[PDB]
């Protein structure tokens, strides 16, 4: 799904057990392989150190 | 002329130009306000966004 | 950049409640996430990339 | 760079499964391609150029030694030795080298 | 002093107001801090935003481009036409900007290197260069043993080894008010040629050669040329560039991936 | 609006954009222990962010022939991080819950529940004789559940789980006089209460007294036309609030 | 009079009749984190009765040809109740601890001890090339000891414990420049010290960074004639002060 | 001015205080001076303390490393991380404390040799040289004639030969408030893998090479570099290493006596 | 700017940062009260200390 825009689509579907996991990724935002080509990711790659929160909106 | 560091410093322009003055470093001023809000109505934190 | 010591934990998420739908509407369903950063964000010690490199002249 | 232990003892009995590992992490330091060796001293026995593996090189020991991992990126070096017997004393080298760091680990094996 | 907004404290709330629940559709950035979606102490914060700025983030020296040129042949010696294409480790940060704006400090390392010359005793004094600029239109030199060099009003520096290296200021030099680093459409009325090329640019070509003469041995020297954005102001920007560039005049690429992939969507 | 809450405790939140109003217990809000009713002769600790904040318990299925579900409360807790481990070096302890349950469906099902905490709901055993066991009355942070079926005889030590008399031998139309919501799923998706400390003694242990129970009773049973998702399952999240313990000693 | 003290703690009290002076750290006393300092974007929890207090470390005895003990400092107290149970389920935390040794003799032995605590003590291996590992670092509140005869070279992962080296490779003597107090059976029968938090950042990790070392050295060794009591214990109690802790997070 | 206590007049008492006699058990040094068991003068006291400060004591310049790389060679060039661990003149001074604080001088005495040449007739100009350093994370270069090296936003220096030796400051640059000299406790939060390692005071790489060519004949040189810690404060003194050093990374050692012996208590 | 030393001297600062002053080497200041007597109660010179 990396070659197309599935990339970005998460899957959800209509489960028949309860509590299961979506999805779960690392947060390095700078060396993980998710948040890296992000434009967050492509800012923090010019520099070495950072701090801060981070949001994450959902939709 | 003289003015503050990162104490005192002290510069002086010797040329007649205006760009071979040096780096100025020190224009620290930010607006987000164009790129993360660029809406017409105003939208207030607390109250829903409809 | 990859390292160990200053390891900033993970992010998941979980099923609360399934997924419920009517009659003649698909089941399956897609979710997008965006990221960005707070207001008391900051950087430091610039460097250069790793991403793009070069052998000759263009 | 750096191995958890760069020399120690072990021992193993005749036709059981030899296992000398060599672990290692990254410093921040360290942003070049990833080069990885073994050597015996009774020549290398195994090579990691590339991201691909070179492992015919000691007749000898052909197919009696892989890697155990598969995240040979992520501080794996370890060797799979099967079938133990004489011939296979000697000093081991498990040299690692990413710019710009080097690491060593010599695994003296006795039987 | 440009420093980052300090947390506030909060206690438990149980009310309407939800501050996290917004609308992604109108395009509108979510702007929630920690101090609204749980329990938070009065931190001050320090940290300065300084070091992230348009003027610390670009002057910085960086290599453009550089040739060479022997001293015993006939038109030995260097053209270049003034560009930042070409070097892909400065071209990327000046793309994440459509306009630009800035006066350049330039830079020359200037080195030497004998050549296998077959006489003996071989033994030359310092070298001198020249680095003649040539503004868009001016006449151009056609070898180095011409009369365009000297007799010649056209900005240039003379430089011999063994010192510092020598170094001009030039300053915004465009028909419009910002360099484009980016241009849509045709050059010429009928919509026919090449396709992202712009006059707003244009700088002028550079003409290196050598002031001495064929002692006993050849001498190849080699130029590096350094720029140095001052007084910079960014506008419109843009995504950074992701693809591998392939050529010096457009955009051409190959497609790829957007990102290197992992095992599974849970790891 | 007016159908939008959102609710935090120490480092988790509750966000719900449909949903009823909150019912505050009997009318009062849980706090500390004033010193005037104050019996503990030292002084109490309070962690109040380390227990403090919304647990999840296990999930639970809503088939169509359901008959209910109960969880004795400061006991499901047991096992649930810090709470869970102060509640055993320590001898006492009080503390005032936020109880939240939640069950969404579309619009095209149709049911209702009674989402009731009933306090120091003793229970009845199957035999006349004998009392229920611990192991059968309760469960870490898991559901028992009632039947539609009257136990038999037979049995030795079990609950009586006819939800006609809602296992406490009373009427069980009756229960609303307790705090409440109802579940509809026509225009409610959750319901949430906040219940004070309520006991006869400022403080008590809390191994051997359950002082609430959150019942769950379909009154109206799910219900949907083929095609509509099958499985509807039920969450409930608990939070203490105003916690304080006392008479510090070994684990047990 | 002037060589009685009374120190309490929580629900715990120490009192010794005949003791000197109690040495205070670098002249700082143990306190929580002013704001102008935190960099946690969160809010800490503060128990503050259930781990300030007197936690007793195991015995050891002292025979006459002793060599030395050492514990490792927040490292010891990994197991005893609320402070360890703390220590596990959070991320970051600080403190400040009360350290007291007491070892008691008749007036007619003779000895002396060295109580020091060594802040970020490094130590070194028995094999120039290894390090030594965890299990022969630190154990949980029990004593590892130092030697009089240098360690073989032949061990893989040892600690070089010559005690004319104190293990980190400098003079046993030099010692004394950090915070101190020596056990004298002549006059002396505990030895008592209030080391606040030192370390170059305002909280950190508490599994993977011994910020102290409590380490007993004995200079004049024990000795007695014949009849007197032929086995001296000592044993050590710390009490942290001023805990608080940040970042929750499933046990580990 | 920092200047030392004079010493006051006595006169010979006879009372119940006694100054001499006290505990040593309570870790409190005696305070007693001179004038307290005999008669002294009153002697005006002029000596200063100055020279003994912390700045006075370490603000002074030591080598550190220094390498080698030869001119006609593929990959010839000298790379090198940046830690005070390896000399062993300059690594004491800094392990008399705990937590440093200080900011930098660099310093590069750059020298070249001529190798054994085999054509007739060898005669080479200036050299220049080329000092970059590397954040911790940035991109490395592999070899010489490679395209990290110019087209890069790092800070280099450019040096010719016969000058002054070239010089950069930099300030503090770490994550802490403070370097550690020391650091007890594992980097993995299951307690494997090495011992005494920290984040806390990496610094980057330091990569140099020729900017020249191969004209005749190989050209090796060698580069020193040289500390200077200013601005510094020290935290936590600590007792001076002993025992001899015998690696980089840990701080193993051999067991060795305390102090050289004599041959009897009463000489 | 000007001050005394070791009559006086004029020193300017040129650089607009910190890290690129020149050394200090006037911090005269000293307070051995933290390694000397770190006790609790304070310790009289002439009184025995028991």
Redesign the interface.
């Known amino acids: 799904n990396v070659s197309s825009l599935k990339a970005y689509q998460i899957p959800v579907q209509s489960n028949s057990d309860n509590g299961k996991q979506v999805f779960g990724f690392p947060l390095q935002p700078g060396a993980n392989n998710v948040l890296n080509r992000t434009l967050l990711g492509e800012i923090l790659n010019y520099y070495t150190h950072w701090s801060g929160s981070i949001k994450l909106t959902f939709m | 002329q003289v003015?503050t560091?990162?104490?005192?410093?002290?510069?002086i322009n010797y040329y007649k130009?205006?760009?071979?003055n040096?780096?100025?470093?020190?224009?620290?001023?930010?607006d987000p306000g164009k790129?993360?809000?660029?809406?017409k109505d105003i939208?207030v934190?607390?109250?829903?966004?409809? | 950049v990859e390292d160990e010591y200053t390891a900033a934990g993970y992010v998941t998420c979980w099923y609360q409640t399934n997924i419920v739908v009517p009659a003649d509407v698909q089941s399956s369903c897609d979710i997008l996430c965006f990221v960005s950063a707070c207001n008391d964000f900051s950087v430091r010690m610039l460097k250069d990339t790793p991403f793009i490199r070069q052998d000759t002249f263009y | 760079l750096s191995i958890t232990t760069p020399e120690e003892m072990i021992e193993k009995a005749k036709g059981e499964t030899a296992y000398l590992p060599c672990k290692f992490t990254l410093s921040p330091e360290d942003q070049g391609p990833l080069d990885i060796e073994w050597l015996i001293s009774p020549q290398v026995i195994i090579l990691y150029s590339g991201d691909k593996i070179y492992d015919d090189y000691y007749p000898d020991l052909k197919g009696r030694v892989h890697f155990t991992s598969n995240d040979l990126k992520s501080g794996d070096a370890s060797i799979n030795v099967t079938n133990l017997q004489l011939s296979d004393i000697g000093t081991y080298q498990c040299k690692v080298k990413k710019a710009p760091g080097v690491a060593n680990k010599k695994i003296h094996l006795v039987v | 002093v440009a420093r980052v907004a300090d947390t506030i404290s909060s206690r438990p709330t149980n009310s309407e107001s939800i501050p996290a629940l917004t609308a992604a559709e109108t395009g509108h950035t979510s702007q929630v801090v920690p101090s609204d979606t749980m329990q938070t102490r009065h931190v001050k914060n320090y940290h300065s935003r300084s070091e992230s700025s348009i003027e610390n983030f670009l002057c910085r020296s960086a290599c453009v481009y550089y040739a060479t040129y022997t001293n015993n042949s006939k038109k030995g010696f260097a053209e270049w036409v003034i560009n930042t294409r070409q070097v892909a480790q400065l071209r990327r940060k000046l793309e994440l900007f459509t306009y630009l704006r800035f006066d350049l400090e330039l830079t020359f390392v200037i080195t030497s290197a004998q050549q296998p010359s077959t006489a003996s005793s071989v033994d030359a004094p310092v070298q001198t260069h020249q680095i003649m600029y040539v503004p868009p239109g001016g006449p151009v030199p056609t070898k180095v043993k011409d009369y365009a060099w000297q007799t010649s009003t056209n900005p240039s520096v003379f430089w011999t080894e063994g010192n510092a290296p020598p170094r001009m200021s030039i300053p915004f030099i465009s028909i419009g008010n910002a360099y484009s680093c980016f241009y849509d459409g045709w050059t010429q009325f009928s919509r026919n040629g090449v396709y992202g090329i712009n006059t707003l640019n244009n700088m002028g070509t550079l003409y290196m050669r050598h002031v001495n003469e064929a002692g006993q041995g050849p001498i190849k020297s080699t130029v590096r040329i350094y720029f140095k954005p001052k007084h910079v102001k960014a506008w419109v920007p843009r995504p950074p560039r992701l693809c591998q560039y392939e050529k010096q005049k457009n955009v051409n690429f190959s497609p790829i991936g957007v990102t290197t992939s992992r095992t599974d969507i849970i790891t | 609006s007016d159908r939008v809450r959102s609710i935090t405790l120490g480092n988790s939140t509750i966000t719900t954009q449909e949903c009823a109003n909150v019912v505050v217990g009997y009318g009062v809000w849980p706090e500390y222990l004033k010193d005037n009713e104050a019996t503990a002769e030292d002084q109490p600790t309070q962690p109040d962010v380390a227990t403090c904040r919304f647990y999840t318990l296990e999930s639970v299925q809503w088939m169509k022939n359901s008959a209910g579900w109960w969880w004795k409360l400061p006991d499901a807790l047991s096992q649930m991080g810090l709470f869970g481990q102060n509640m055993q070096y320590h001898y006492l302890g009080r503390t005032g819950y936020t109880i939240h349950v939640q069950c969404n469906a579309s619009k095209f099902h149709q049911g209702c529940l009674l989402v009731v905490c009933v306090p120091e709901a003793e229970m009845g055993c199957s035999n006349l004789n004998n009392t229920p066991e611990f192991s059968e009355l309760s469960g870490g942070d898991s559901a028992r559940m009632f039947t539609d079926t009257q136990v038999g005889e037979s049995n030795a030590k079990k609950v009586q789980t006819a939800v006609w008399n809602a296992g406490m031998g009373v009427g069980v139309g009756n229960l609303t006089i307790f705090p409440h919501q109802w579940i509809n799923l026509r225009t409610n998706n959750s319901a949430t209460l906040v219940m004070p400390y309520i006991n006869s003694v400022p403080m008590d242990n809390m191994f051997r007294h359950n002082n609430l129970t959150l019942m769950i009773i379909p009154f109206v049973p799910l219900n949907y036309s083929e095609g509509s998702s099958p499985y509807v399952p039920i969450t409930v999240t608990i939070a203490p609030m105003c916690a304080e313990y006392n008479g510090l000693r070994l684990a047990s």
């Open positions: 003015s560091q990162k104490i005192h410093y002290t510069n130009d205006a760009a071979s040096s780096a100025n470093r020190q224009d620290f001023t930010q790129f993360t809000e660029p809406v939208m934190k607390t109250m829903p966004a409809l």
